[PDB]
Symmetry: C3
């Protein structure tokens, strides 16, 4: 792990968000920077029958860590996006289960 | 919360599905209409090496409520889509965990 | 269930991956081939401020089965993708909860 997914933001803004990001995340999560992936997810928000700006919605798929690491990642992500948008920044952490996760055919 | 995602349907049909929808959902879930987001998710279904019509697949990400609210949302979604398609309508509810969910850097 | 989603690969490669696949999966999981859906998910990987090749990332949404079925599906998927790419092949299994899953408005 970890796998970060962003929806609700422009693709190029997601690319820019990732500059230096795996270094910082690796330090906070105490794991190598190379264990991080980042995606822009292609979606469209709607509300009451119209196109909506939605929000910036970020999923973090990882082997869970304590709340201190989680809280710091949330703060970091929120601070970074708030520089570019006044949209709400929403972050959900999704704990992976080791025996349900495979990398190249074996557990991680 | 709640975050509704739709795949397998035309983007404009997802937009139309959302007309009035957050009012009705807010009433069933007992929360404000403004707490709902809706997305079309860009995906392509395949089956046995060919393009497939797939089904209409709906994810609801929320703080879980009882089965009565869940059952009513499922019925509502199914009835609405069945007006437009004879495709199977599949709905999955995904319970969020409060300490793993952040809005603007704090828990909800 | 089961619902297989692939990201990080070309759309046509996902289509080809699915040739014969539901037969084989049905045999391993002991359920009908028709219970399987397959999607290409439209996403873009980034790393350190640049476009990245990412990896091939596969999600399997299903009613959980034992590790033997899981391990065999993982091996099968990995072997098939390794024929086409030297990218890392990552597979996550996501257990569905029966009372949170609806097909045409009723539980499965």
């Amino acid at each position: 792990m970890p796998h970060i997914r962003v929806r609700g933001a422009e693709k190029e803004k997601v690319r820019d968000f990732t500059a230096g990001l795996a270094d910082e995340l690796g330090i906070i999560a105490e794991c190598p920077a190379d264990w991080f992936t980042f995606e822009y997810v292609e979606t469209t928000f709607f509300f009451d029958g119209k196109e909506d700006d939605g929000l910036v919605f970020i999923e973090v798929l990882w082997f869970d860590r304590d709340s201190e690491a989680r809280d710091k990642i949330a703060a970091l992500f929120t601070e970074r996006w708030k520089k570019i948008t006044d949209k709400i920044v929403t972050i959900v952490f999704n704990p992976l289960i080791e025996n349900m996760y495979y990398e190249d055919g074996v557990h991680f």
